[PDB]
Design a protein around this ligand. Structure first.
Ligand SMILES: Nc1ncnc2c1ncn2[C@@H]1O[C@H](COP(=O)(O)OP(=O)(O)NP(=O)(O)O)[C@@H](O)[C@H]1O
Ligand SMILES: [Mg+2]
Ligand SMILES: [Zn+2]
Ligand SMILES: [Zn+2]
Lengths: 97, 616, 156, 635
DNA sequence: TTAGAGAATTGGAGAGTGTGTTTTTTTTTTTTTTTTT
DNA sequence: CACACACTCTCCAATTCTCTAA
C-alpha cells in the first residue's frame, strides 16, 4: 500500500490536503520513495467495510486506487514534449545522437 | 498412586534417619502452640540439606533435582504426615481442621550444574530444580489466591468443600478448576460460602534480573519471572541481590491452540520458588561470632582507631584523610530523634565533594558504593526526577495503578552516590531538596496521593562551573548550585589538584605501586577474569556500631559544641550548622563503641567541620 | 443496491439503503430457500456522492462567550465541496435523526459501549440511541480565468 | 467435585446460643434486657442499626460457665468467620423483635401496603371453595463491635499485616483514609410488577452484578399460562447506602524501602459518611474476597481481589465560661501573643502582629476588613514553622507552599471533570498561609491581586465564566536570593516581588538572622537541650491552650467595634506626620493603604479587649507595629 | 340442514447449536520546531 | 473454561378443513 496525498502546490492555501490509499502489486512495489511527487494511473475501486458504515452512520464505501502504472513528476512539468513513465530514459536513436 | 506411595515411605525413612528434621518440625510446632494458643508465628516450612539427602539416597536426591514434580510432592506429603503424627492439641478450631495447610520443603547447598543465572537458564533446564542468582526488580502486589472453598449445606448441616487448581499452585499438571464457587449442592440444597473456613494463600510475582557486573560484552541484562507464595511473599524488595531456588517450569498452550495463527511464539516460563536467600556482598548481613565481637570490642579501645578505620577506607586512594574521616562518620551515621509535634530530626550526614578533575571524587563514590550495607549509584545525566522519586506504572498481573520506587526510595536507611551532581537538570534537582529536608518524597499524580519514606544520606560529587576551581572567585560563583540546596549538605568539601613537587612525587609513586598489583594465583602478564584492617572486617565493625550503640548527648560535649559553634558564627554558617556538629559528635561516639557523646567526640567533630569550612 | 444470490445465481435490484447496509431477506427465485449469502454487483448498483461537514454556532452570535455548540451536516450530489473550513455558510434541508448503527446489528461489526430505546426485533436486548444531524439540499457561502472571451460573457 | 467434612461447629447450637443471648442479656453490672430494649427502639422506628458488642458475649459466656453450663465458644466463632453470623443474628433478631408500642403512621410506607395486598390476595385465592425474602422487611443494619483489650480483633493491623489467611475473619485495621466515593444506592432486593397478573415478585441480589427477571412466574400467571411481563419498580425495591473508601498504612508502619499499600473498605447502611479523607482511623471490619462475576471470573483465575466490610470506626483524634477564665487572668493581649508558637523564643512584635490576622479588621458597605501580613528576611529564622503554627492555631486556616488558584481539572482519578477550588478558595473567611510566596507562577501571582482588589477569583475556561467569592486574610513569607539577606539593599533588591504587590500588605516585616555572642548562646542552649530531652524546654511562663485561644477569638471577632470621635481626630494627626516624614531609602512611603491598615489594626486590637468601641490608648499601639516594621526594614 | 367424526396443516415449545465477553490509555522519555524566551 | 443471547431445527398437539349420517 501507498498513502498518496495532494501536492502542496495544487492544494489551495489554508485548506486541508486530501489523500487516497493506492495499491501496488507485482513489479510495481518499491517504485516510489516517501516524499516524491508521483503521478499514478490506475483503477478507481470501492468496497464495503463496516467501520465506515459504523462511524459515519450512512451506507458509505471506502475507495482505493489499484495502481496500473507510476511516473515521477520530475522535469519542468508544464511541457507537452516529454512522454513515458521516465523522462530521463533514452531511446536507441537518442543514445546514437 | 503406586510410585508416589513408595517415594513417601522413602522420604519418611530419611526424616527418621536425619533426626534434626524431626527436631526442627518439633521446634516450629511448640513455638506456634505457645504464641497462638497458650499466650509472632513460624511457617510450616523446613529447609533440608540437599547434601544429607545425597548421602541417604542418591536416587531420591537425583529425582529431587531432575524430576522434582514427581519427587517433591511425595517428600512434602511424607513431611506433612510426620508433623501430623507429632501434633497434639485439645479442642482444635474449625479453621485449623479445615486449613489445607501442609508442610513445604526448601533446600540447601551444592546444586552443581543446576546453579544458574537469568542468562544461562535455558529450555534444557525446564522441569528441573534450579538455583538462580540475580537482582530483584518489579515485585508485584500481593493477592490472595483461592485454594479451598468451604460451603455449608443448610437443610442438612454438612460442610462441603472444593479444592482449586492453577498451573502456578502445583508442581504437577491438573485439569484447571474454573474459579467459580459451588452455588447449589449435589442434592439441590442451597450452599453458603464459609470464608474463614475457606483457604487462601498469598501470591506474588517477582522479576529477577542478571547482575549487570556479569553481563557479557555489549549485551543487556536478561531476566526471569519467579512465583512466590505462602511465607515467601515479601521476603524481597526491588534492588535486593538474591539467590532463589525453585522448579523452573513451563506454562500455557504456547500457541498450540487454534485460537492463534502466529506459529513463531513460544511457551511462557516461570520459576516456582521453594526458597529465597538475600545477598549484599559482590549474605545480606554479616552474622557475628563471639570472636568477631571480641575483636571489634578490643580494637575499639586503641586511641588511634579513627585513623585506623578511616585509612582502611579506600587504601588505593592517596591523601584525602579528612574526607575519608567524614565518609567513616557517614557510614556510622548519627542518631535520629522522632520528637513530638512532628519535630523529626535527621541522623544522616550528607557530603558534597566539589573540585578539580582527577582527584578521586568518583573513585571515592565508587568506594562508598562497595563498602556500605545499602548503596545506590546514580549520575546527573542518567537520572530523571521521576526515576529518583517514584514512577507510575501498571502492575501487569493485576491491571492496576502502582508506584515503582526511585533511587532515593530504594536507598532508604542507606547511601545515595550521586556523581556528576552539577550536571542534573533544574527540574531533577527539585526532587533532591525533599529527600534532604524531609527524608520523604510526596507523590501527587495519576490519582495516587502519598508520602514515601526516603531516609537516606546523600554523598555527591561535582565540579565548579569553570572546569577547575577558580581561586580568584567566590564559592557562590565557582559552585553551580542554589545556596538553599548547599545548606542541606553537612560537609561541602572543596578539593583542588595543585602542583607541588613533593606531593606530585608522593602520589606518583603511589599510583605506580597501585598499577603493579598482581592478584594471588595469576601469572606475570595474565589477563584478569603500621596498622590497617581488611574491608570485610571494616564492614562488620560498621554493622556492629549501628546495631549495638545509640549514643546519648552529654554535658561535656555540650560545653564544647556551643563554645565552637559560637566561635564559628561570631567570625556561610547558619542555625543548621549547629545540628551538623551534633551529628558528627554522635557519629564519632559510635566509632568508639560508646553510649555517651564525650568532650573528645565534640572536639573531633569541630576540627572535621572547621577543616571543611576553612580548608585548614 | 443490487445483489446476486450465491445459492441460485438470481439477481435482486433497486434495494433501498437505510442508515445501515442492507442485503435482501428473501431470494426472488421460488426454487431458492436462501435468506442470506448475497454478493453486490458493483456495475448495476448506483452510488450517490456524499460528504460530512461539521459546523458550529457563529463566534459573534454566542450569547456570553460560552463554548461553541456544533452540528453535523451531510451534503450530497452536486452540493459536495461547496463549502470550506473557517467559511460562514447557510444550509437548507431537513433536520434528521441518525441511529447509532453499531447497536442496529450492522453486517460484520461489534456494538459499541446515555440510555436509548429497546424492544425491537433487530435490537433484541440492546438499546438504540440517536444523534441529531442535518441533511442539506442547498448550500450558500456568506463569508483566475484570464481571458476576455470568458470574462465578457461572465458579466451581464 | 463436592466432598464433605466434620467441622467442630454446629450452627443449630450457636443459633440457640444467640437467641438465648439476645433475650436474656442485661449489663445490670453497670449498677430490662439490653437488646430487647434496643429492639423496641427499632420497632418504634426510633433506631436504624443494631450494634452487637463482642465484649458482651464474653460476659454471657462467663456467666454461663459460672452457672456450669458450657456456652459453645461463640466469640471464637464470630471472630473466626464473621460473615455468616450477620445472617444468624438477623434471624435471631427477627424471631424475637417485639410489636411496636408507639404509633408508626404505617400507611406512609409503601411496603406496608404492598405486603398487605399480597397477604389479602393469598387469603382470597386460598379460600378456594418464606412468603417473600425476609431481607426486604429488615429496617435495620447489624454491626459487630470488636473486643477491647481485657482476641485477634483487639490488635490493630497495618495494611501489609493482613495476609490471605485472614479472609472471613473480623479484623481491625489502622491507617489514613486516602479517598472516599460519593454515596450511591446499592440494591439488595429488587421488586418487579407483572403487568398482566398484577402480582409482585422479588429478586434478591448478593453480587457486584445480577440478571433481571423479565418473564412472570407468579402462581396465577403460570397457572393461567399467561406470559406476563415483569417491570422493575424502584419505589418498592430495597436499597442500602453504599460508599467505597480506600485506606493506606501510616508512615511509621512501612518497612524500610517499601511503598504504602492500601485496602478497599466497603461501608454499607447507617455507618456511611463516618469516614473523611485524611482521617487517621481504626476501622474494624469483615475481611472478604470480592469474586469476579461473568466472563472476567474465568480469565482472572484463582487470583481473588479483596475488600473490608466496615463494622465500627474509631477516630484517633466549658466553652462559654473558659473565655471568662482567660479574661479574669488579665493582660490577654501580651499573653495570647506570647502563646503563639511558644517554642520560638523572642520575635515578640511579630507574634503581636500575627495575632491581629486571626482576629482581623471589619468589612463595610465593599471595603476590606481582612489584614495582610508579609514576613521577610533570612532563611533559618523558622518563618515556615511560624506560618505552620498559624495554620494549626487559626480557624479555617490553610498552609500552602510555592514549592494555588482555582481551575478546571479534567479526569482527576475518575474519568470526569471538576472545577477545583484552590487554596485561596479553601481559605474562604479565614487565613491563607502562603509560604515560599515568591516561588510562584505569574498566573497565580496575578491571581493574588484579584483576591486583594475584588475579594474573589475568576474562571474563564470550558464555558465556566464564573466568579467565586474568596474573602481571606493573607499571611505570606519569602526567602532572599544569594542565600542570605544583604543589609546594603532593599527588600525589592533581595526578593522578586514588585512594589505593586509588596506594598499591598498592611504589614511587611523584615526579620534577620543577626549574629551575636549572647543571642547565639541563647539559641544554641535551647537546641542542644532538645537533643538531650525529647520534650520542649521549660517556657518559664504558662501559655494559653490553642483550643481556649480559638474559643476566645471566635467570640472576640463578632463584636465588630465602631469608631469613637477621638480615633478619627487622632489618626490624621499621626498619618499627616507619617506622610511628612515619607517626603524626607527604599519604598516605605505612607500610602492611604497604611491609613486603612492602621484602622484595621486598631480594630483587631479593639476586638481582643472585648468592647463596643475603644479609646486611643489602643491606636497608639497600632502605630507602633508599623513604626517598628519600618525600623526593621532599615535594620 | 345441523352436528359430529376423521384427515391435514400450522404454531411454538423446547431442544439444540454457536458466538462473544476482559479492557486500558496515563505516564515517562526522546525527539524536533516555534517562540517566547 | 461458562453463561447469556441469537438463531435454526424438529416434533407434537391444536385448530380448521372436509366428509358422513342423524
Ligand atoms: N589521590 C589519588 N590517589 C590515587 N589515585 C588518584 C588520586 N586522585 C585521583 N586518582 C586517580 O585519577 C583517576 C580519576 O579519578 P576520578 O575519581 O575519576 O576523578 P574525579 O576526581 O571524580 N575527577 P572528575 O571525574 O573529572 O570530576 C582515577 O584513576 C583515580 O584512581
Ligand atoms: Mg570523577
Ligand atoms: Zn437463490
Ligand atoms: Zn404475571
Amino acid at each position: 500500500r501507498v498513502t498518496l496525498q495532494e501536492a502542496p502546490g495544487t492544494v489551495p492555501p489554508g485548506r486541508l490536503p486530501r489523500h487516497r490509499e493506492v495499491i501496488l502489486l507485482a513489479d510495481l512495489v518499491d517504485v516510489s520513495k516517501p516524499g516524491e511527487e508521483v503521478e499514478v494511473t490506475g483503477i478507481y475501486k470501492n468496497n464495503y467495510d463496516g467501520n465506515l458504515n459504523a462511524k459515519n452512520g450512512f451506507p458509505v464505501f471506502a475507495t482505493i486506487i489499484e495502481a496500473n502504472s507510476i511516473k515521477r513528476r520530475e522535469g519542468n512539468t508544464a511541457n507537452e514534449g516529454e512522454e513515458g513513465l521516465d523522462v530521463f530514459s533514452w531511446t536507441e536513436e537518442e543514445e546514437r545522437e | 498412586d503406586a510410585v508416589f506411595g513408595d517415594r513417601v515411605r522413602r522420604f519418611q525413612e530419611f526424616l527418621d534417619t536425619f533426626t534434626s528434621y524431626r527436631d526442627s518440625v518439633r521446634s516450629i510446632q511448640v513455638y506456634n502452640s505457645n504464641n497462638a494458643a497458650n499466650y509472632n508465628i513460624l511457617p510450616h516450612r523446613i529447609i533440608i540439606s540437599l547434601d544429607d539427602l545425597r548421602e541417604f539416597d542418591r536416587s531420591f536426591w537425583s529425582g529431587i533435582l531432575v524430576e522434582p514434580a514427581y519427587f517433591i510432592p511425595p517428600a512434602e506429603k511424607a513431611l506433612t504426615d510426620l508433623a501430623d503424627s507429632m501434633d497434639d492439641v485439645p479442642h482444635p478450631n474449625a479453621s485449623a481442621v479445615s486449613s489445607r495447610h501442609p508442610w513445604k520443603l526448601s533446600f540447601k547447598g551444592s546444586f552443581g550444574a543446576h546453579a544458574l543465572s537469568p542468562r544461562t537458564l535455558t529450555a534444557q533446564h525446564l522441569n528441573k530444580l534450579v538455583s538462580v542468582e540475580g537482582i530483584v526488580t518489579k515485585t508485584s502486589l500481593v493477592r490472595p489466591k483461592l485454594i479451598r472453598s468451604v460451603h455449608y449445606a443448610a437443610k442438612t448441616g454438612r460442610f462441603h468443600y472444593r479444592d482449586y487448581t492453577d498451573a502456578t499452585t502445583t508442581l504437577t499438571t491438573r485439569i484447571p478448576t474454573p474459579a467459580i464457587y459451588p452455588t447449589e449442592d449435589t442434592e439441590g440444597n442451597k450452599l453458603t460460602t464459609e470464608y474463614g473456613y475457606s483457604t487462601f494463600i498469598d501470591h506474588q510475582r517477582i522479576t529477577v534480573q542478571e547482575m549487570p557486573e556479569m553481563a557479557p560484552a555489549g549485551q543487556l541484562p536478561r531476566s526471569i519471572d519467579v512465583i512466590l507464595d505462602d511465607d515467601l511473599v515479601d521476603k524481597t524488595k526491588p534492588g535486593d541481590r538474591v539467590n532463589v531456588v525453585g522448579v523452573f517450569k513451563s506454562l500455557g498452550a504456547g500457541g498450540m491452540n487454534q485460537s492463534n495463527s502466529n506459529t513463531l511464539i513460544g511457551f511462557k516460563t516461570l520459576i516456582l520458588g521453594n526458597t529465597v536467600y538475600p545477598l549484599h556482598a559482590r549474605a545480606a548481613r554479616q552474622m557475628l561470632t563471639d570472636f568477631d565481637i571480641r575483636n571489634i570490642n578490643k580494637l575499639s579501645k586503641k586511641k588511634d582507631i579513627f585513623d585506623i578505620l578511616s585509612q582502611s577506607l579506600a587504601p588505593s586512594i592517596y591523601g584525602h584523610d579528612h574526607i575519608k574521616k567524614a565518609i567513616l562518620l557517614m557510614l556510622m551515621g548519627g542518631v535520629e530523634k522522632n520528637l513530638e509535634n512532628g519535630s523529626h530530626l535527621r541522623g544522616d550526614i550528607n557530603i558534597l565533594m566539589v573540585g578539580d578533575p582527577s582527584t578521586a571524587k568518583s573513585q571515592l563514590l565508587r568506594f562508598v558504593l562497595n563498602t556500605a550495607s545499602l548503596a545506590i549509584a546514580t549520575t546527573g545525566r542518567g537520572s530523571s526526577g521521576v526515576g529518583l522519586t517514584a514512577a507510575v506504572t501498571t502492575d501487569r498481573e493485576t491491571g492496576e495503578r502502582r508506584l515503582e520506587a526511585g533511587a532515593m526510595v530504594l536507598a532508604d536507611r542507606g547511601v545515595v552516590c550521586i556523581d556528576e551532581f552539577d550536571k542534573m537538570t533544574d527540574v531533577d534537582r527539585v526532587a533532591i531538596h525533599e529527600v534532604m529536608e524531609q527524608q520523604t518524597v510526596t507523590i501527587a499524580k495519576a490519582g495516587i496521593h502519598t508520602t514515601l519514606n526516603a531516609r537516606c544520606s546523600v554523598i555527591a560529587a561535582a565540579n565548579p562551573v569553570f572546569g577547575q576551581y577558580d581561586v580568584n572567585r567566590d564559592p557562590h560563583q565557582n559552585i553551580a548550585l542554589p545556596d538553599s540546596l548547599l545548606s542541606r549538605f553537612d560537609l561541602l568539601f572543596v578539593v583542588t589538584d595543585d602542583i607541588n613537587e613533593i606531593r606530585d612525587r608522593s602520589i606518583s609513586e603511589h599510583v605506580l605501586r597501585t598499577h603493579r598489583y598482581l592478584p594471588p594465583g595469576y601469572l606475570e602478564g595474565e589477563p584478569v577474569r603500621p596498622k590497617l584492617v581488611t574491608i570485610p572486617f571494616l564492614r562488620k565493625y560498621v554493622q556492629y556500631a549501628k546495631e549495638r550503640v545509640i549514643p546519648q548527648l552529654t554535658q561535656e560535649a555540650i560545653n564544647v559544641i556551643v563554645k565552637n559553634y559560637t566561635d564559628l558564627r561570631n567570625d556561610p554558617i547558619t542555625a543548621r550548622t549547629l545540628e551538623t556538629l551534633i551529628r558528627l559528635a554522635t557519629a564519632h561516639a559510635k566509632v568508639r563503641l560508646s553510649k555517651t557523646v564525650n568532650k573528645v567526640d565534640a572536639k573531633v567533630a569541630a576540627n572535621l567541620l572547621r577543616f571543611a569550612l576553612l580548608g585548614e | 443496491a443490487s445483489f446476486t444470490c450465491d445459492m441460485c445465481r438470481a439477481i435482486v435490484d433497486n434495494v433501498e439503503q437505510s442508515f445501515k447496509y442492507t442485503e435482501p431477506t428473501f431470494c426472488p427465485n421460488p426454487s431458492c430457500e436462501n435468506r442470506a449469502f448475497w454478493t453486490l454487483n458493483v456495475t448495476r448498483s448506483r452510488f450517490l456522492d456524499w460528504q460530512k461537514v461539521r459546523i458550529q454556532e457563529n463566534a459573534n452570535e454566542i450569547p456570553t462567550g460560552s463554548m461553541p455548540r456544533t452540528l453535523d451536516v451531510i451534503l450530497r450530489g452536486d452540493s459536495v465541496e461547496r463549502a470550506k473550513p473557517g467559511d460562514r455558510c447557510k444550509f437548507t434541508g431537513v433536520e434528521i435523526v441518525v441511529p447509532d448503527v453499531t447497536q442496529l446489528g450492522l453486517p460484520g461489526v461489534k456494538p459499541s459501549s446515555n440510555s436509548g430505546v429497546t424492544g425491537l426485533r433487530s435490537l433484541g436486548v440492546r438499546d438504540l440511541t440517536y444523534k441529531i444531524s442535518f441533511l442539506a439540499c442547498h448550500v450558500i457561502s456568506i463569508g483566475n480565468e484570464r481571458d476576455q472571451e470568458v470574462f465578457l460573457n461572465s458579466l451581464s | 467435585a463436592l466432598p464433605s467434612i466434620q467441622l467442630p461447629v454446629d450452627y443449630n447450637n450457636l443459633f440457640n446460643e444467640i437467641t438465648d443471648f439476645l433475650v436474656t442479656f442485661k449489663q445490670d453490672t453497670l449498677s430490662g434486657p439490653k437488646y430487647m430494649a434496643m429492639l423496641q427502639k427499632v420497632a418504634n422506628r426510633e433506631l436504624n442499626s443494631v450494634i452487637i458488642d463482642l465484649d458482651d458475649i464474653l460476659q454471657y459466656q462467663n456467666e454461663k460457665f459460672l452457672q456450669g453450663t458450657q456456652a459453645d465458644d461463640l466469640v471464637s466463632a464470630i471472630q473466626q468467620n464473621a460473615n455468616h453470623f450477620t445472617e444468624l443474628f438477623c434471624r435471631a433478631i427477627d424471631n424475637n423483635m417485639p410489636l411496636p408500642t408507639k404509633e408508626i403512621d404505617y400507611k406512609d410506607d409503601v411496603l406496608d401496603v404492598i405486603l398487605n395486598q399480597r397477604r389479602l390476595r393469598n387469603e382470597r385465592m386460598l379460600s378456594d371453595r418464606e412468603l417473600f425474602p425476609p431481607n426486604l422487611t429488615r429496617r435495620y443494619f447489624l454491626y459487630f463491635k470488636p473486643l477491647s483489650q481485657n482476641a485477634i480483633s483487639s490488635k490493630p493491623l497495618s495494611v501489609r499485616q493482613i495476609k490471605g489467611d485472614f479472609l472471613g475473619q473480623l479484623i481491625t485495621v489502622r491507617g489514613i483514609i486516602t479517598r472516599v466515593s460519593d454515596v450511591k444506592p446499592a440494591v439488595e432486593v429488587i421488586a418487579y410488577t407483572c403487568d398482566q397478573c398484577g402480582y409482585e415478585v422479588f429478586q434478591e441480589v448478593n453480587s457486584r452484578t445480577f440478571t433481571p427477571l423479565s418473564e412472570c412466574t407468579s402462581e396465577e400467571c403460570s397457572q393461567n399460562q399467561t406470559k406476563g411481563q415483569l417491570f422493575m419498580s424502584t419505589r418498592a425495591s430495597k436499597f442500602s447506602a453504599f460508599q467505597e473508601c480506600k485506606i493506606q498504612e501510616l508512615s511509621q508502619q512501612v518497612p524500610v524501602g517499601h511503598i504504602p499499600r492500601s485496602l478497599n473498605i466497603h461501608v454499607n447502611g447507617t455507618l456511611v459518611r463516618s469516614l473523611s479523607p485524611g482521617d487517621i482511623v481504626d476501622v474494624t471490619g469483615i475481611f472478604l474476597p470480592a469474586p469476579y462475576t461473568g466472563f472476567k471470573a474465568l480469565k482472572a483465575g484463582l487470583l481473588t481481589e479483596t475488600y473490608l466490610e466496615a463494622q465500627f470506626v474509631r477516630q484517633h483524634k466549658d466553652v462559654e465560661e473558659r473565655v471568662m477564665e482567660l479574661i479574669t487572668s488579665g493582660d490577654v493581649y501580651n499573653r495570647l501573643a506570647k502563646s503563639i508558637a511558644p517554642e520560638i523564643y523572642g520575635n515578640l512584635d511579630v507574634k503581636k502582629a500575627l495575632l491581629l490576622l486571626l482576629v482581623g479588621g471589619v468589612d463595610k458597605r465593599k471595603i476590606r476588613g481582612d489584614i495582610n501580613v508579609c514576613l521577610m528576611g533570612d532563611p533559618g529564622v523558622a518563618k515556615s514553622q511560624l506560618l505552620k503554627a498559624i495554620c494549626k492555631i487559626s480557624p479555617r486556616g490553610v498552609y500552602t507552599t510555592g514549592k494555588l488558584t482555582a481551575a478546571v481539572m479534567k479526569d482527576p482519578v475518575t474519568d470526569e471533570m471538576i472545577l477545583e477550588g484552590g487554596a485561596l478558595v479553601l481559605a474562604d473567611n479565614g487565613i491563607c498561609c502562603i509560604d515560599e510566596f515568591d516561588k510562584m507562577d505569574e498566573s497565580d501571582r496575578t491571581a493574588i491581586h484579584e483576591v486583594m482588589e475584588q475579594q474573589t477569583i475568576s474562571i474563564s475556561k470550558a464555558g465556566i465564566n464564573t466568579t467565586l467569592n474568596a474573602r481571606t486574610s493573607i499571611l505570606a513569607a519569602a526567602n532572599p536570593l544569594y542565600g542570605r539577606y544583604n543589609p546594603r539593599l532593599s527588600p525589592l533588591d533581595n526578593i522578586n516581588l514588585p512594589a505593586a504587590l509588596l506594598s499591598r500588605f498592611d504589614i511587611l516585616f523584615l526579620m534577620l538572622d543577626i549574629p551575636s555572642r549572647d543571642d547565639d548562646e541563647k539559641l544554641a542552649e535551647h537546641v542542644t537541650y532538645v537533643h538531650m530531652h525529647n520534650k520542649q524546654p521549660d517556657l518559664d511562663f504558662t501559655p494559653v491552650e490553642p483550643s481556649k485561644m480559638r474559643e476566645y477569638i471566635a467570640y472576640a471577632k463578632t463584636k465588630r467595634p465602631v469608631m469613637s470621635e477621638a480615633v478619627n481626630d487622632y489618626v490624621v494627626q499621626a498619618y499627616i506626620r507619617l506622610r511628612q516624614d515619607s517626603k524626607r531609602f527604599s519604598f516605605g512611603q505612607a500610602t492611604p493603604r497604611t491609613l486603612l491598615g492602621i484602622i484595621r489594626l486598631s480594630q483587631a486590637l479593639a476586638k481582643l479587649r472585648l468592647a463596643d468601641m475603644v479609646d486611643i490608648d489602643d491606636v497608639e499601639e497600632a502605630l507602633r507595629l508599623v513604626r517598628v516594621s519600618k525600623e526593621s526594614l532599615y535594620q
